[PDB]
Every structure is written in structure tokens, then in C-alpha cells.
Design a protein around this ligand. Sequence first.
Ligand code: CL
Ligand code: SR
Ligand code: SR
Length: 476
Amino acid sequence: QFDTNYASGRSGMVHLFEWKWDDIAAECENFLGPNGYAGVQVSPVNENAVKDSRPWWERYQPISYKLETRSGNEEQFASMVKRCNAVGVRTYVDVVFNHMAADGGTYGTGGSTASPSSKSYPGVPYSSLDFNPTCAISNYNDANEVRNCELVGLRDLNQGNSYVQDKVVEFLDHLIDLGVAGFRVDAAKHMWPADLAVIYGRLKNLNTDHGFASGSKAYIVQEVIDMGGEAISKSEYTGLGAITEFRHSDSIGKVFRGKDQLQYLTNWGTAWGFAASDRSLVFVDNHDNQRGHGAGGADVLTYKVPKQYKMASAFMLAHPFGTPRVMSSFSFTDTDQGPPTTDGHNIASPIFNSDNSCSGGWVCEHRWRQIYNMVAFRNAVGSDEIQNWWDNGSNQISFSRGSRGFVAFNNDNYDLNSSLQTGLPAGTYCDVISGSKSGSSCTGKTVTVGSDGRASINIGSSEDDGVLAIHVNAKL
Ligand SMILES: [Cl-]
Ligand SMILES: [Sr+2]
Ligand SMILES: [Sr+2]
């Protein structure tokens, strides 16, 4: 429940927001696999309610547990898991069993129909007896009202009923048979941990046919928003699985936006109020946080602030704390707007340029050179500890991961021109933020490390990038 089940020597979970299964399987073999990524988080794979203008949040109003979405059907989803597992990329499913669709959602994405006014869902065989009595969440400080009342009209299921427990376990076991490696449980704060423990304990072992070790259990990351000093604590859930550490997203936004100083990052971890490292799923932004009014509000860094979003992603991928997750979104100017379509419904596949960058309505942050080359940085340093910390007392910091990698940041209004201790063997290194290694040359900046371990690091305060990075797996 705490082991990621990652393949050997890989790191980084990519949330391919609203991608279809066919496009995900191709991206596993063409990019994610040969670039060292560890896993992919998919949108809900079960049938959801069809709503006007096809908003993104329609996929969190389940109609049934049939694998029938705009992303594809069960046959395409199963082939996607098999093809991604063959290149070493695991699959983690966003699962929604706290509620069903609200009023106005009579049609499903796979042919099923429902009647939320009577709490009747013929696809799951669900009846009104399987739900909590109708009530609305208004207080948010009453831990009983948050877990038993209806969230924005969504029909609150009763996870204490043995029939509901059967259907959820039946659905999660079906996904395990298809080769899935873990689950992201949506709205976990609105459910009782005692009932979650029963569901989690009944799940079968992982399918060894997909290259899983015998005795492997499904990875469990729980979506809990705990900004500190709340009625519901994240410690209620850290005993049953990993949690979404949203303090990481809100703090990393404040720091790299200038609202806090970079020198304070010297004790990044539980000293900043985070959960345990082996219990923390960390990220810069998520599909909710990037739209505002999330857990971090306006302080969250998104792709729309590219220079500081890349610096924040580079710091997270270089720090040993937690399990990093990188967001891959589609461009939006309206928080309700859904993914790009070829008409008004059929999701349009992403297209790629000579950059290996995305187009056609998708941003593809995981294909940014500054992001996927830092994933290689994480894979090259392993479990090496932080050493050689330096800072100027403001917004210029640098540290090394053992003797295998070095990174430097400049968030001040003036340049960085210092001879810093790098901790690496002497030689010539390619700046992995500004380029890559090709044969015996560097695409971007070059970094020369002297016999004393010191190197000249230069990051102008007006350059497009505010971070430099080098590691031993990109020498010469
Ligand atoms: Cl999340
Ligand atoms: Sr609930
Ligand atoms: Sr200080």
C-alpha cells in the first residue's frame, strides 16, 4: 500500500490529464519509456455522465463501473496497460467511489442511463438504499457532516454497506487483473478511514504476468487536502496509504514566486509541515490546483508562469523528499473548458513537432527539456544524500546530491557569478537545463569542474531559465 511498484531505475509519475488510452500507449513507447519515467496517472476509466459543453469535471460524476469513457473502452485500456508495462511504465487509475452523478446526468459515456433524482443507477445495479440520506455539506468543520453529506449535489454513497463494499472491491480487482499498479482515490477526505481499510485490505495481489513481484500490493495514494490546523487530519489516512501533500504545492508556489526566500529551503521536508517522505505524493500543481480556488489558490505555479514553473519542478525532482508527480495538462482560458476536440466531443489526439514538443491544444509539460532532463537527474543520483549546501542569504542557492549531481538556482533580481563547490569528479559537464549531451558535445551551456570540485556557475537574473543542473550521467 506504500510501495510504488515502480520499475527498476525509474522515477516520475505523469498525470496525462484527459488523454485517451490509444495516445497514452504510444507515448509510453515513444517518449516515457526511453526517457526514464516511472508511471502514468490516467483520468477515471469508468463511465461518467455526459454534460453540456463537455466540461472536464464531468468525468468525476460516475454513471457506472463499465470501462467506457471518451478516452476509450476496456479493450483499449487493457492494451494500453500491457504496452506501457512492456517499456517499464506503470499505470495508476484515478478512482471515484465517494459519489455518483448528480441531477441532470441522465446519459452515460458508454450507453448506460441513470436517474440521480431517485438515486437509481442500473449500470452498477445501485439503488437509493446504497446511499446516505440526502443532506448538503455546509459547515466543513463537522467531520461527520463532511463524510456523510452530499458534495455539490453528488449522491453520497455509503461505503459502510456490504453491498457497496462488494461493488468497489469488484471494480478495483478488475483493474488489477488488467495489470494496474496502483490507485488514486478521489475525495478520500469525504470518506471514513475505517471503511477504506476494509476495501483496501480485500484487494488481491498484483498481476505477476505484467512483471510484478510475488506478494505485491496496490499502491494507494489518497486525495486529502490538509493545509494544517483543520478538523480532519492527514494522519487519519497515512496509516492506510500515501497522501497528497498539498502543503508542498502551496509552499513551492510561494517560494518560487518571490513571496518567500529560497534560503529557507535548507530544511525542506517535515520541517515545513509535510507528512513523512515515504507517505507523501508531491507535485507542483494538479488538475484542480492549476485552475485556481484549489488547495493553494492563486499561489500555485502553473505552465502559464513558465520560468518559475520550471525552476519549481527542477527543485522537486532534485530533492529526495517524497514521490514526485509531474502534471501534463491541456491549455485552457476557462476553468470549465474541457480537453481539445475535433468537433465538440471527440477528443483530439496531441501532435508533435520537430522539438519533440506538443501542439494541438496540449501543453505536455513532461516533454519540456527542463523537466524530462531533470527526471534523468533524479535517476542518476539515486539515494545519494544532500551535500555542499550554499546560499547567499536571499534567493541564490545551490546543493549537490552526494557526488553524483549538482544544481543551482537564481531567483534574485541580480545575476549569479560565483565559483561554487559542485561535489562531482573533475571534467566537463553539459547544462541539462539548457541542453543535452549529443556524442561528445553539449547542446546548451558547458560546465567545467576543476580538480578541487569547484566550477564557475553563471545564471543571469534575466535569462529565460533560472536553474542550472549537471550530473555524472551526462559528462563530456
Ligand atoms: Cl491529486
Ligand atoms: Sr461521503
Ligand atoms: Sr539563513
